[PDB]
């Protein structure tokens, strides 16, 4: 592949790579052509990595986000749509991976994760962790074994990544 800007990650495998790091951040470093939001149906940034990102616009990205939702309506779980990255990206791929506090089906990770085969380079978090509710652990194994693309993992907290590193292989 093409050499790029990412730094400081781990390899995971051909083409997943992993680092402790704050997304926002990391997006307005290096300015990616696509930037991953942890996003609802709704399109509600209200927190998680979406209210961070939507925070690092300004709200910008929830206004676009609203007329998105009026237009087209609610996003399906496992789905995405691709707006706008603002000040952090070129583009911002929004995609739903299941809640398991409310009770949605797991299986629909793997489908949330290939989306990100639509995109050669992508920076992302790991979907459906934090605030969803599942176990990053396996969100890293189920991205691994459906993203075929390169993928940039950003992991918020420095116990999960080392865990996530530390039970990989």
């Not at 990206?89 to 809640?99: E, Q, S, T, Y």
């Not at 797991?106 to 992508?122: P, T």
């Amino acid at each position: 592949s093409m050499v790029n800007s990412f730094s400081g990650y781990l390899k995971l495998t051909d083409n997943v790579y992993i680092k402790n790091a704050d997304i926002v951040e990391e997006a307005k470093k290096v300015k990616p052509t696509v930037v991953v939001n942890a996003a609802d149906v709704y399109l509600k940034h209200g927190g998680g990595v979406a209210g961070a990102l939507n925070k690092a616009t300004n709200n910008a990205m929830q206004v676009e986000s609203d007329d998105y939702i009026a237009t087209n309506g609610p996003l399906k779980v496992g789905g995405s749509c691709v707006l706008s990255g603002h000040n952090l990206a070129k583009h911002c791929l929004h995609v739903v991976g299941p809640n398991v506090n409310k009770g949605e089906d797991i299986q629909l990770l793997k489908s949330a994760y290939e989306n990100f085969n639509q995109h050669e380079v992508l920076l992302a978090p790991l979907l459906s962790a934090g605030i969803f509710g599942a176990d990053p652990i396996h969100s890293l194994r189920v991205c691994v074994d459906t993203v075929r693309t390169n993928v940039y993992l950003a992991v918020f907290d420095k116990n999960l990544y080392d865990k996530l590193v530390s039970s990989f292989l």
